[PDB]
């Protein structure tokens, strides 16, 4: 249920192509995103594609250097990137999209790809006690926030993310009650309450910016529990 696959080592200025196989759900009906991951920092939105192949958008970080792809038939999401720069290191995820409310639900595991600021405002960390009230607010613009509904994701250590909360504040099949999203114009924020030991993660609150066109991803907040 999504593999990545065709990472390496590259040289600046070089060429590269990924791939990600689909398993479980049919593959043609949702639009599929790569999201990349730097070494050891947050999340970074790269390019999507409609199940259509209709509506493509890139990363302004990426714009006209890669090129996403799909072949519905064969079941797998393709990458193709060039001119690719030291900076373009990172992990690549490919995330199946919600056609309904814009949300991750799938991610894969990651393939890494080696060469040898945001506009929206987490805090980087979070401390808090085992049983106490813990809120993560993420502050976005008139453009992003203000106007589209936010996703939050909850990555834990090595693991790729989870969809933690979307729609605003709908918890997915799993999530559990302890866990509850808002949004109050331009801010959104994230609430756990009664913090438990496991909630040791790393949390990233997503908007569609319909400005930039482009997904906007939170500078993340890394949850300590005490």
């Known amino acids: 249920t999504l593999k990545e696959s065709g990472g390496g080592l590259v040289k600046p200025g070089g060429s590269l192509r990924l791939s990600c196989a689909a398993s479980g759900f049919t593959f043609s009906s949702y639009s599929m995103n790569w999201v990349r991951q730097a070494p050891g920092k947050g999340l970074e939105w790269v390019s999507s594609?409609?199940?259509?192949?209709?509506?493509?958008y890139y990363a302004d970080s990426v714009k006209g250097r890669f090129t996403i792809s799909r072949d519905n038939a064969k079941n797998s999401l393709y990458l193709q990137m060039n001119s690719l720069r030291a900076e373009d290191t990172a992990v690549y995820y490919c995330?199946?999209?919600?056609?309904?409310?814009?949300?991750?639900?799938?991610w894969g595991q990651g393939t890494l790809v080696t060469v040898s600021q945001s506009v929206l405002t987490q805090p980087p960390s979070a401390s808090g006690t085992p049983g106490q009230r813990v809120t993560i607010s993420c502050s976005g613009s008139?453009?992003?926030?203000?106007?589209?509904?936010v996703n939050w994701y909850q990555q834990l250590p090595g693991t790729a993310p989870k969809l933690l909360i979307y729609?605003?504040?709908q918890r997915p099949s799993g999530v559990p009650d302890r866990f509850s999203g808002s949004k109050s114009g331009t801010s959104a924020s994230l609430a756990i309450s009664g913090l438990q030991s496991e909630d040791e993660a790393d949390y990233y609150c997503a908007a569609w910016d319909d400005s930039l066109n482009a997904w906007v991803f939170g500078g993340g907040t890394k949850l300590t529990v005490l």
């Open positions: 729609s605003n504040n």
């Open positions: 594609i409609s199940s259509s192949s209709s509506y493509i």
């Open positions: 008139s453009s992003n926030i203000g106007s589209n509904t």
């Open positions: 995330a199946r999209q919600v056609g309904a409310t814009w949300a991750f639900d799938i």
